[PDB]
Design a protein around this ligand. Structure first.
Ligand code: HEM
Ligand code: HEM
Ligand SMILES: CNCCc1cc(C#N)cc(OCc2ccc3c(C)cc(N)nc3c2)c1
Ligand SMILES: CNCCc1cc(C#N)cc(OCc2ccc3c(C)cc(N)nc3c2)c1
Ligand SMILES: C[C@H](O)[C@H](O)[C@H]1CNc2nc(N)[nH]c(=O)c2N1
Ligand SMILES: C[C@H](O)[C@H](O)[C@H]1CNc2nc(N)[nH]c(=O)c2N1
Ligand SMILES: [Zn+2]
Lengths: 411, 409
């Protein structure tokens, strides 16, 4: 069964055969599409097929399919599942798994870079302090004084689900949010809940509009612990605008390293519940979502005011106008400080090339249009007129429940 | 199986029960989502369940479900089908059918106005000249001197597929597209092929670039005929900018009346191949789409150039900045000339209200996030953080092959 996607801007057609390798499910049916829904304990019974499938993939990619090396490895993993009810990945396997999880991440516009991931194996870690140490080295290596480098750090896999490693932060670096008594929010509204947890766990909040949050780290199923990333490791960029001198006076800055830490890495049935990964920012992530979203910093209005915009009628597009300027300033700031950033035009063009290259050498590229198209200027980026097929491949990154909702407290 | 959708900006949760009454298919499966794909004759046995399904919802909507009247009409249609192999809608059913075809159009952000559709029954029409007349009356009524009103005009239903009524234009009003020897195009690149087909069938093009295309009308499956819409019926808006008075000299205008004419309307099994319908523009449909789309006017370059923006690297966001000004202007021009137009903030906010309404009174509202989200500034509109469920209800508007690929000549 061959499937076709058309680019309606260039009439280019591609043929997806890769969707047949799809194991997981979308949530869609023949009678309903859940394409815009954000979100749609493992026994040896269903593990070896998941293991076998992964090892078949791996040994295929290294062109050793059905070799004695391949067959012994299967046999070896089998006996280990038979006797220990889990199994350990070799280093080569882990690296492959991490890179393909990213490659398979259908909502990621930045996957042209997937094969250049720096994989830190932290499977020997046993304590939160050791987690803190691995994360510091990640941040330092990834940041690289502004010349950002893709990296992922992988903590030990889940076992009986009672001894999980978790990074409780949604990102390694993120600013606090404080609900004031009068209903207003100081800092980043997105992080109010997590801030409160941290504070309960004994964090001394400076209560400023741009305080870096502490790391809240859980090793081996134990209660999480608070650590402060060394300020000198957190690279930040003051936000100014190239024509607007008053923009600097808005007092804004943002951190340079986007590093997501609350997801789950699945490789051959194994689950890595703590697997922080990082790349670099597309400008709109900060400028459109992190400032202008109504449930965020919402400087939108204050930027509009200082531009002396007609803020009466929305048909003046003052909202649209301020949004462009804020994204202009975000790109301007990061470039001026030689901190790696990409604009949404560059990233989408790059992705289209990636996708075509993927269809030719892999027979497909799973892609989530709803998430790949940029949150501003959609139709003037080339992904907008690009049909995309969405399906789920393993290895993968998955969502998992917030740890504070599932964790059993030791004391 | 009582599905829930969440707004992530507001945490409002709605529960969708209406999707269980879905008949048609989406194109997706458990293994693959086709949510971004643009495009995924009836026997007696196929027809009657379709008729019954339609008549059942009709009589429920008028609170006379299971009534003598209901049962009367069911037997009545049933008998006509076994005899004539088809049937005819009562006027009331036609109006209900049409309005609900709009209500169910999951890709339409304008559906809050769905019940105020003006239906023009054109089923007595027999010729292209007749179609032209019904269409001129539609255009004039809809336009209403700039105060636009929704309308649909419905021509005879398909019979045996050889007697089809078809409006060959994609819209009633659209500018011509001529490609120059030079290489590029002038007029409107989307219409290049059709502009050729008109000339190919005898149109004499004014080869300016805002030349309103002729109508190409097909009655009862005959060869189609060219007709020129009276210019005084074609309301146009000169495009100026409220702050940049160099903008006027770009020489741009657009027509006030968006009127889609190539879709098929399906009611209780019956197929209306000619059914032009019209409302009023969302600003972005002309500015983010009919000016800057690289496969159309693509005047972005020209605009930024005499905004003298730094067009050296994409990271200056000059395209974005220009895109916004063009759209500010479109809105400004229409409002200035008192021609109806809605901005993308207003329409999306309207739709959220409409959506809530439909969950409340109907139990659901099929919606295609990929088309509902405007082509600019998506994330600062309320629909962006709105989860939506997409499914196919009937009555519906559907796509159909372009006539020139089909029509036996
Ligand atoms: C190197 C430059 C990268 C860029 C520019 C980039 C860009 C993006 C953007 C803009 C999104 C949409 C998220 C949103 O708007 O909320 C996204 C999603 C995602 N990215 Fe990438 N990314 C990069 C690197 C990476 C890396 C290194 C990984 C993993 C190792 C990764 C994995 C993912 C995943 C799993 C998602 C889906 C999130 C979800 O399902 O909620 N990305 N990316
Ligand atoms: C009155 C104001 C209206 C507004 C503002 C509006 C807005 C829109 C917009 C922005 C689209 C996106 C399509 C594109 O960008 O190319 C759309 C699609 C659509 N509209 Fe509405 N519309 C209106 C009235 C109507 C009426 C009166 C009908 C029919 C009774 C209708 C039926 C449809 C259908 C069927 C589609 C999708 C066609 C497809 O599946 O490709 N609309 N509309
Ligand atoms: C406004 N969107 C918030 C929704 C969201 C949820 C989760 C989770 N869990 C993770 C998310 O992250 C997406 C993502 C992941 C990794 C990224 C990397 C490595 C770099 C980058 N520039 N953006 C990313 C973006 C987003
Ligand atoms: C660039 N996208 C083109 C895809 C498209 C195809 C067809 C068809 N056939 C019909 C389409 O119609 C969209 C539409 C239909 C009716 C509208 C009405 C009545 C009013 C309005 N403002 N926009 C409409 C927009 C679109
Ligand atoms: C490929 C892509 O899905 C397709 O071009 C769609 C995307 N969203 C759209 N949205 C609107 N409003 N109009 C369109 O024509 C499209 N085109
Ligand atoms: C409801 C909606 O699907 C949800 O808010 C999605 C839409 N598209 C998105 N796209 C990106 N890049 N990031 C997001 O967080 C979202 N959110
Ligand atoms: Zn789907």
């Amino acid at each position: 069964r061959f499937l076709k996607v058309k680019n309606w801007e260039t009439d280019v057609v591609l043929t997806d055969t890769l969707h047949l390798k799809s194991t997981l499910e979308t949530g869609c049916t023949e009678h309903i599409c859940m394409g815009s829904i954000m979100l749609p304990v493992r026994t040896k019974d269903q593990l070896f097929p998941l293991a076998k499938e992964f090892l078949d993939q791996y040994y295929s990619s290294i062109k050793r399919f059905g070799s004695k090396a391949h067959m012994d490895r299967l046999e070896e993993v089998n006996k280990e599942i038979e006797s220990t009810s889990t199994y350990q990945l070799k280093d080569t396997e882990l690296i492959y798994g991490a890179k393909h999880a990213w490659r398979n991440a259908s909502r990621c516009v930045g996957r042209i870079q997937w094969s250049k991931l720096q994989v830190f194996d932290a499977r020997d870690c046993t304590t939160a302090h050791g987690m803190f140490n691995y994360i510091c080295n990640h941040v330092k290596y990834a940041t690289n004084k502004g010349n950002l480098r893709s990296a992922i750090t992988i903590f030990p896999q889940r076992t009986d689900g009672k001894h999980d490693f978790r990074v409780w932060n949604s990102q390694l670096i993120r600013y606090a949010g404080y609900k004031q008594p009068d209903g207003s929010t100081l800092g980043d509204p997105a992080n109010v809940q997590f801030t409160e947890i941290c504070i309960q766990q004994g964090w001394k909040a400076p209560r400023g509009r741009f305080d870096v949050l502490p790391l809240l780290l859980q090793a081996n199923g134990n209660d999480p612990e608070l650590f402060q990333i060394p300020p000198e490791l957190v690279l930040e960029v003051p936000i100014r605008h190239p024509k607007f001198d008053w923009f600097k006076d808005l007092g804004l800055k943002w951190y340079g390293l986007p590093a997501v830490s609350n997801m789950l890495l699945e490789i051959g049935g194994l689950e890595f519940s703590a697997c922080p990964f990082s790349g670099w920012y597309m400008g709109t992530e900060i400028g459109v979502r992190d400032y202008c979203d109504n449930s965020r910093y919402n400087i939108l209005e204050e930027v509009a005011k200082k531009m002396d915009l007609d803020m009466r009628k929305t048909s003046s597009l003052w909202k649209d106008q301020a949004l462009v300027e804020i994204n202009i300033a975000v790109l301007y700031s990061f470039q001026s400080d030689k901190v790696t950033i990409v604009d949404h035009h560059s990233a989408t063009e790059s992705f289209i090339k990636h996708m075509e290259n993927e269809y030719r050498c892999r027979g497909g590229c799973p892609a989530d249009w709803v998430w790949i198209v940029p949150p501003m200027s959609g139709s003037i980026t080339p992904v907008f007129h690009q049909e995309m097929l969405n399906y789920r491949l393993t290895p993968s990154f998955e969502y998992q429940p917030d740890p504070w909702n599932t964790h059993v407290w030791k004391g």
